[PDB]
Amino acid sequence: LARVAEALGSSEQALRLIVSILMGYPFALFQRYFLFQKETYLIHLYNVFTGLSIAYFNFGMQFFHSLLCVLIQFLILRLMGRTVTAVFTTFVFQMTYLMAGYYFTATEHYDIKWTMPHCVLTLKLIGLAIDYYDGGKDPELLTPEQRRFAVRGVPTLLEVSGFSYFYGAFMVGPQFSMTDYQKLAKGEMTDVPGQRPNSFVPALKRLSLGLLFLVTYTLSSPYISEEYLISDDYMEKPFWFRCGYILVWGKIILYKYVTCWLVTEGVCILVGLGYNGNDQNGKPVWDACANMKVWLYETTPLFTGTIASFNINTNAWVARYVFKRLKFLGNKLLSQALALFFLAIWHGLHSGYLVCFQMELLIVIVERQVINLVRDSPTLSTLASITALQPIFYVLQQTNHWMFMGYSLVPFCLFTWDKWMKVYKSIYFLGHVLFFTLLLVLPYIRKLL
Amino acid sequence: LARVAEALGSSEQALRLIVSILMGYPFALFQRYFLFQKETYLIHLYNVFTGLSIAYFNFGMQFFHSLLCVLIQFLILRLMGRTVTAVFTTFVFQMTYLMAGYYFTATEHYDIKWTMPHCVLTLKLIGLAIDYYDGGKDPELLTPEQRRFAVRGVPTLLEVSGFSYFYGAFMVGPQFSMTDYQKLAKGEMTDVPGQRPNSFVPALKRLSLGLLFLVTYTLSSPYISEEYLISDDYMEKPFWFRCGYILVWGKIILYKYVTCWLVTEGVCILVGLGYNGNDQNGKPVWDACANMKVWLYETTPLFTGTIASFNINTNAWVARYVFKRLKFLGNKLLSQALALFFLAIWHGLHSGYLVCFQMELLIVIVERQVINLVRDSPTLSTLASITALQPIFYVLQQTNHWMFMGYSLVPFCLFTWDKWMKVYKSIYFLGHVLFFTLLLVLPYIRKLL
Ligand SMILES: CCCCCCCCCCCC(=O)OC[C@@H](O)COP(=O)(O)OCC[N+](C)(C)C
Ligand SMILES: CCCCCCCCCCCC(=O)OC[C@@H](O)COP(=O)(O)OCC[N+](C)(C)C
């Protein structure tokens, strides 16, 4: 409806996405109470129907495209099951399908179109194929976590269709594995063997936090937007103020993402999929499929402290299915680039993503070098601080972290060859030149000390 | 000059290219008579100067890009000389440079721009890198051709610069190897151990034939052009006539290529680079760096007989450095489906090339299947012919060959999504559907017989 779209002050696409995400709670409540007896095919059909309904509500003309990619893989997965070339052909097919979709969409403004659910689906399917090939090997140890994380059996059409179309983690949801989905289907993922998983208390906290972030972001949205950055006229304000804007911006655009992940956690933890075990005391731990770690993402002066708390899940998937599969190159420095290149193509086909990831690589390397210089061969360095007082150091580090994360996040939201450089040149290319000088000078001063 | 361009009836680019190609003959005549004493650096400097002048007279200010590829490789070739990763990095760098040039250069007409000399240069440099890598291995009993080609030593800047900028084979010239260039530089490519090689008699034939083809093509150029097909008002004559046009066309557009190769052969055979050995009788053989074999390209009813008579210096290079190097994977078909893909990218970035190469692959497979069915399992099918009277079969086969080679060469000269399909749909997609039906039916009828 256009009336509600104009009333809420945002485009109808975002409202439709939010209502689709929020519609998962009644589905989970219905599932948790009417499926005590298993009869797994009921769960599989229910998941398929709910996922198809969710896809039809939003993308109600092109959803059958997804129904293609599930079926074709099932053929490729069936024949040449354990050969190496199956992995190659499925990887190439999925990549070329995604690239064709991206090329034929190629919209300039940020739009929530057909692309993202298919992106999540195709990455999950590649993961499933890799896992099946890995589990097809000999039953020896092979890094026992890898052994227990593999799949053994025949993945018939019903199981793969149900696992592909989970209603909760479909749009932007967390990426689970194949082995644990069958555990949920077979009902061995509960707090105790013979009762419903008691998870009401964890879910409300996540829902409250996600709603709080959502409401504060939508309240603070009109004040700051990615149009003041150029405006063709306001590129004359005092330099410091401009930097201050980049400090206020970036920290606000991130809250657009966070909330949805948090809220989808609420629909993913209620069904019991977020169980991993108990702690030393024995109490249950529900932080298994979490996509965000609040209270560490905020207060983290280190540049590397925002890489293990922001995305966490996709990063873990990339590390597990790229680094562990390219141990025969042996360079140890090429792979860390190649993975990023893959992460620079999975997001999109524009140019801003490459520059953003290059800046992230440069900043993390510089931070590693600086933290290696101190506290390892400090001499005067540590006893100069002597831990007498570090309020000023902490606040300066925090401001530096915010400013130089927003400064590299600018090309993420503006991914055109013209607007990016037009808004980026007014800052005198500060970050790249400064960090290049630091990188080229630091070994010399380290050798001096 | 525009006056000569309008007088000759062709654009100034073609005339400039032809005059540049023809300008090599005084260079070769000067070289053959004033360089009895070797002092190799004189030859290297002469080659560099002549190649740079030729590049200047065609592409005035842009030629430095070519230099920007010769020097960088010399660095990559110097450090990490014998490692595996050197091949990977030089391959990726050359491919991405060529792709960037093509993407920034792409136009909708056939333009003689910066691309082609850089394309030849980059493919030659990739070949040099592969050959140098295959020279640092153990000197065991490899394949004799590998030992005959492998280079041992360190290529300094002068030698690589001279070998890269050969004046004769620069624009569209044949692609020789690295080891034999040093043989020419050291003066051992002669009929008699020491004297000027006797090559006047072989050379004049390649001028007579080349000039004959050139004059016939330029005389018959105005009658047939690639505009009558797409005029959209000439698509209404009866069906057969249209097919007849495709028979007359295609066989004419090919003569645009042939001549130049022939003529550059004349400037490549005079210097003595076309020597390979003697025959059984003992007379010299000069068909070493030939790029086309006339008297077999014309009268060849077989569809596979036009692959060993067209350009046999790029096909041989591809087979030597891709087809017979990816034997570790061991599929025997995927490689045949991979190398062509490389050949589908080296030509350009448009879409017509892929379809043309796919059609060539399909027709050659169909021809192989048909020739396998006959003369191997006749079953009273050919024992009755006994060569009684079959000129009709020969002429029918020749007409079929011409028609279905032109029908697949059409997308080569028209490489846009719109023009190609508009000109191709009026023929009712005859070749693809016919060959698909033949491919799907032939095994069944073979099993029947
Ligand atoms: C209150 C309004 C709610 C707004 C809805 C936005 C949902 C966040 C998208 C998360 C998708 C994802 O997992 O990729 C994470 C990153 O990749 C971010 O992705 P992008 O923001 O660049 O979107 C284009 C790239 N896709 C297509 C691959 C998703
Ligand atoms: C009387 C007038 C003379 C006309 C001059 C034309 C010269 C023939 C080009 C041969 C280049 C080559 O070796 O590639 C052979 C094929 O690749 C053909 O190539 P194309 O015709 O498609 O040209 C674009 C592709 N390049 C850029 C790679 C060369």
Author numbering:
A (entry chain A), B (entry chain B): 42 to 490
The study reports:
A reaction chamber was revealed in the LPCAT3 structure where the lysophosphatidylcholine and arachidonoyl-CoA were positioned in two tunnels connected near to the catalytic center. The structural and functional analysis provides the basis for the re-acylation of lysophosphatidylcholine and the substrate preference during the reactions.
When the interactions were impaired by the mutations of those tyrosine residues, the enzymatic activities of cLPCAT3 reduced significantly. The sn-2 hydroxy of the glycerol backbone sits in close proximity to the catalytic residue H388, ready to be activated into a nucleophilic reagent through the deprotonation by the imidazolyl of the histidine. Interestingly, despite the empty vertical tunnel in our EM map for acyl receptor-bound state (cLPCAT3/LPC), a long, lipid-like density was revealed in the side pocket which meets the electron density of LPC at the joint point near to H388. Manually modeling the acyl of LPC into the density failed to generate well-fit models, suggesting this lipid-like density might not represent an alternative conformation of LPC molecules bound. Based on the absence of density corresponding to the CoA moiety, we speculated that this unmodeled density, in combination with the large density for LPC, might represent the PC product partially bound and co-purified with the protein.
